Design a protein around this motif. Structure first.
Motif, PDB file in Angstrom:
ATOM      1  N   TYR B  37       0.875  -1.193   0.000  1.00 37.12           N
ATOM      2  CA  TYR B  37       0.000   0.000   0.000  1.00 37.12           C
ATOM      3  C   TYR B  37       0.902   1.230   0.000  1.00 37.12           C
ATOM      4  N   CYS B  38       0.654   2.208  -0.874  1.00 36.08           N
ATOM      5  CA  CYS B  38       1.419   3.477  -0.868  1.00 36.08           C
ATOM      6  C   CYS B  38       0.597   4.600  -1.481  1.00 36.08           C
ATOM      7  N   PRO B  39       0.978   5.860  -1.189  1.00 34.49           N
ATOM      8  CA  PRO B  39       0.308   7.028  -1.757  1.00 34.49           C
ATOM      9  C   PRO B  39       0.444   7.039  -3.282  1.00 34.49           C
ATOM     10  N   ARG B  40      -0.665   7.297  -3.967  1.00 35.09           N
ATOM     11  CA  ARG B  40      -0.724   7.240  -5.453  1.00 35.09           C
ATOM     12  C   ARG B  40       0.196   8.310  -6.051  1.00 35.09           C
ATOM     13  N   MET B  49       2.255  17.421  -9.908  1.00 37.07           N
ATOM     14  CA  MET B  49       1.654  17.573  -8.553  1.00 37.07           C
ATOM     15  C   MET B  49       0.814  18.859  -8.447  1.00 37.07           C
ATOM     16  N   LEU B  50       0.870  19.771  -9.418  1.00 35.62           N
ATOM     17  CA  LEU B  50       0.025  21.000  -9.415  1.00 35.62           C
ATOM     18  C   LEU B  50      -1.451  20.654  -9.661  1.00 35.62           C
ATOM     19  N   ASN B  51      -1.745  19.845 -10.673  1.00 35.66           N
ATOM     20  CA  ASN B  51      -3.132  19.470 -11.067  1.00 35.66           C
ATOM     21  C   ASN B  51      -3.095  18.086 -11.715  1.00 35.66           C
ATOM     22  N   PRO B  52      -2.664  17.038 -10.976  1.00 37.58           N
ATOM     23  CA  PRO B  52      -2.457  15.715 -11.561  1.00 37.58           C
ATOM     24  C   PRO B  52      -3.777  15.055 -11.965  1.00 37.58           C
ATOM     25  N   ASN B  53      -3.801  14.422 -13.132  1.00 38.47           N
ATOM     26  CA  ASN B  53      -4.884  13.488 -13.539  1.00 38.47           C
ATOM     27  C   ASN B  53      -4.381  12.071 -13.256  1.00 38.47           C
ATOM     28  N   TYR B  54      -4.627  11.566 -12.043  1.00 40.71           N
ATOM     29  CA  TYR B  54      -3.999  10.301 -11.573  1.00 40.71           C
ATOM     30  C   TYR B  54      -4.395   9.138 -12.483  1.00 40.71           C
ATOM     31  N   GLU B  55      -5.637   9.117 -12.968  1.00 42.03           N
ATOM     32  CA  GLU B  55      -6.122   8.054 -13.892  1.00 42.03           C
ATOM     33  C   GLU B  55      -5.229   8.039 -15.140  1.00 42.03           C
ATOM     34  N   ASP B  56      -4.977   9.203 -15.736  1.00 42.14           N
ATOM     35  CA  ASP B  56      -4.168   9.344 -16.983  1.00 42.14           C
ATOM     36  C   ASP B  56      -2.699   9.017 -16.701  1.00 42.14           C
ATOM     37  N   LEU B  57      -2.169   9.482 -15.564  1.00 40.84           N
ATOM     38  CA  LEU B  57      -0.762   9.255 -15.159  1.00 40.84           C
ATOM     39  C   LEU B  57      -0.520   7.767 -14.919  1.00 40.84           C
ATOM     40  N   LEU B  58      -1.473   7.089 -14.282  1.00 34.35           N
ATOM     41  CA  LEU B  58      -1.339   5.669 -13.897  1.00 34.35           C
ATOM     42  C   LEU B  58      -1.380   4.798 -15.160  1.00 34.35           C
ATOM     43  N   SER B  81      -3.181  -1.490  -8.772  1.00 33.11           N
ATOM     44  CA  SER B  81      -4.521  -0.865  -8.875  1.00 33.11           C
ATOM     45  C   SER B  81      -4.568   0.344  -7.954  1.00 33.11           C
ATOM     46  N   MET B  82      -5.360   1.342  -8.330  1.00 32.58           N
ATOM     47  CA  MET B  82      -5.606   2.555  -7.515  1.00 32.58           C
ATOM     48  C   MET B  82      -6.918   2.360  -6.753  1.00 32.58           C
ATOM     49  N   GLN B  83      -6.906   2.590  -5.441  1.00 32.01           N
ATOM     50  CA  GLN B  83      -8.121   2.665  -4.590  1.00 32.01           C
ATOM     51  C   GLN B  83      -8.123   4.049  -3.950  1.00 32.01           C
ATOM     52  N   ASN B  84      -8.987   4.942  -4.425  1.00 30.75           N
ATOM     53  CA  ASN B  84      -9.087   6.320  -3.896  1.00 30.75           C
ATOM     54  C   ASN B  84      -7.695   6.944  -4.054  1.00 30.75           C
ATOM     55  N   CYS B  85      -6.997   7.291  -2.968  1.00 33.69           N
ATOM     56  CA  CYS B  85      -5.697   8.011  -3.078  1.00 33.69           C
ATOM     57  C   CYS B  85      -4.519   7.088  -2.776  1.00 33.69           C
ATOM     58  N   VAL B  86      -4.747   5.774  -2.721  1.00 34.23           N
ATOM     59  CA  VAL B  86      -3.621   4.832  -2.487  1.00 34.23           C
ATOM     60  C   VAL B  86      -3.511   3.859  -3.648  1.00 34.23           C
ATOM     61  N   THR B 175      -4.685   9.798   4.698  1.00 27.01           N
ATOM     62  CA  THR B 175      -5.809   8.910   4.326  1.00 27.01           C
ATOM     63  C   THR B 175      -5.887   7.783   5.356  1.00 27.01           C
ATOM     64  N   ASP B 176      -7.026   7.098   5.401  1.00 24.32           N
ATOM     65  CA  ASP B 176      -7.107   5.729   5.953  1.00 24.32           C
ATOM     66  C   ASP B 176      -6.430   4.781   4.946  1.00 24.32           C
ATOM     67  N   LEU B 177      -6.373   3.486   5.228  1.00 23.21           N
ATOM     68  CA  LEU B 177      -5.630   2.533   4.369  1.00 23.21           C
ATOM     69  C   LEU B 177      -6.511   2.063   3.197  1.00 23.21           C
TER      70      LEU B 177
END
Ligand code: YHJ
Ligand code: YHJ
Lengths: 304, 304
Positions: B37-40, B49-58, B81-86, B175-177
């Protein structure tokens, strides 16, 4: 960002804690290689603790009289000896979890982590300073004796403290791992005086540098001072005199912040004379002296 | 004797910390069974990190792009896999040191231990409260993200927190886990407001009971109050309103000390209106709200 009182990670030390029982008395022991270290007052009944003759009390004890329990399992005691105020119980099994370690007699003003234990099980971990009067401000109940204080330097554990007792002021006293008390204390139930609780000046200055690094700078004033001038004000407030070795120790923090040590001293002098005026520094309403300069550098640089 | 801010022993959690690297970005991951488990935001460049599109980056990332290091050794990533912010990185090896564990979303006012880590190595351990405004007052530098907060209940680790960022006030958010932030926070480089930092009233009262148990009773006065009367004064000082559930939670401490909860409330009211007059309670010059009633009972009864 932020500045907290922070203990070392305790995992290496958790693996060395055992339970030592004589008669009715249970406390904690430290299992390193094939030796268990514990406070000699494990041998005392409640009667004995007023004026114990430890030599005479120990003479009635054999190997089999010491019950040493490593979690679930009973260790076999194959020898016992008293060194100053600690018992060394030789056991037939080397602790397989023995970390790299040293025993160090720590200097007043230096800090260490306490792993508070009961019945050989860890309760919690917190930082303490060995105070100039050789007391510590811990959290210890009945059964806590044998709990240890330590530093870690990369993978090496430096054991510096074993817990033996409480003073009437509510502060704590103990030994190095050679069983020599810090300060004038003895292991018997008498009222014992630590003297004047002097403030660790170099640590207060380190923490004011921590505050400036973390953006708290309201207390920085327009004046400077001299060691001799500052010390006149230190004396009045039961502060340790500041010496050139202290100025040298603060040099890297002075450099990183661009605030001369004697300018920070002038700031401290005004805080001592004027108080805080209801203000706070790093979320404290008084001057904190339980961070060493090293603790400040360690914490502000992420040492692991 | 004595009352200290005390972390859980960290050994069980030390054994779950790994290093996770994407490109140039290294942070901490939590290795439980065959999942890390780690921060996305491990996937972000400094631009992103200014305005990341995590879906597109991942979407540009494959299994082999994540370097997971457990001390010396490289873990093989066989799924992500991404779950929320992890991020959940599936690895081909179950952590043999996986303790009994649960993931819990902790309530505001509850406390937990932070194991501050850099490059997957423990730096130190300290207690935090999840504040009513869902911030914590920690000590975190660059590289600390993925550090976790936990409680222990006998042998079971309850993970409640993963570190993601700093707010402009110098407080911390995570976040929680399951990767859901505590409070209104998002994982991007914008100025984010926590609102009013309200004081945890039930925790202040718990700590005043701690003070009386430890023999500090100068602040006990001759008056009583009512919940409605106290709350009028709480409101003014940005204290949480005291409720009957809070009175019930303090009942065992009220009983042990023989001081009615509303009598302690009257004491607190006078401290809020009059301050401390240069006096201290358990070696603090302000009212401490980061001890829960349970923390007070745990510490004052030697729970292990
Ligand atoms: C060891 O577990 C125990 C630790 C104490 C218990 C309460 N808080 C704490 O730190 N140590 C003792 O109980 C020692 C024991 C060994 C040596 C002599 C006895 C008595 N004692 C002690 O702490 O003396 C306390 C005291 C305080 C004021 C006046 C007289 C005695
Ligand atoms: C993770 O290691 C890092 C932890 C921070 C670093 C400094 N102290 C601390 O707690 N987290 C960040 O650097 C995050 C990163 C992930 C999500 C977006 C970036 C930026 N960031 C952050 O903490 O923002 C700080 C900030 C403060 C004021 C104004 C803007 C941004």
């Amino acid at each position: 960002s932020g500045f907290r009182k922070m203990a070392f990670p305790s995992g290496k030390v958790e693996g060395c804690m055992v339970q030592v029982t004589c008669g009715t008395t249970t406390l904690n022991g430290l299992w390193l290689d094939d030796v268990v270290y514990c406070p000699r007052h494990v041998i005392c009944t409640s009667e004995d603790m007023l004026n114990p003759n430890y030599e005479d009390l120990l003479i009635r004890k054999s190997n089999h009289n010491f019950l040493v329990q490593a979690g679930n399992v009973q260790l076999r005691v194959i020898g016992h000896s008293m060194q100053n105020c600690v018992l060394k119980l030789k056991v037939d099994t080397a602790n397989p979890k023995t970390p790299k370690y040293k025993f160090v007699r720590i200097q007043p003003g230096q800090t260490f982590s306490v792993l508070a234990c009961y019945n050989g099980s860890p309760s919690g971990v917190y930082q303490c300073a060995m105070r100039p009067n050789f007391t510590i401000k811990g959290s210890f109940l009945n059964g806590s004796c044998g709990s240890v204080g330590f530093n870690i330097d990369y993978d090496c554990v430096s054991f510096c403290y074993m817990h033996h007792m409480e003073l009437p002021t509510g502060v704590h006293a103990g030994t190095d791992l050679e069983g020599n008390f810090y300060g004038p204390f003895v292991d018997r139930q008498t009222a014992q005086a630590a003297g004047t609780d002097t403030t660790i000046t170099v640590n207060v200055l380190a923490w004011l540098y921590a505050a400036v690094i973390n953006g708290d700078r309201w207390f920085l004033n327009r004046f400077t001072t001299t060691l001799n001038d500052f010390n006149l004000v230190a004396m009045k407030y039961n502060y340790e005199p500041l010496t050139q070795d202290h100025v040298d120790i603060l040099g890297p923090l002075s450099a990183q912040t661009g605030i001369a040590v004697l300018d920070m001293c002038a700031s401290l002098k005004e805080l001592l004379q004027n108080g805080m005026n209801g203000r706070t520094i790093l979320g404290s309403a008084l001057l904190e002296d339980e961070f060493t300069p090293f603790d400040v550098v360690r914490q502000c640089s992420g040492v692991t």
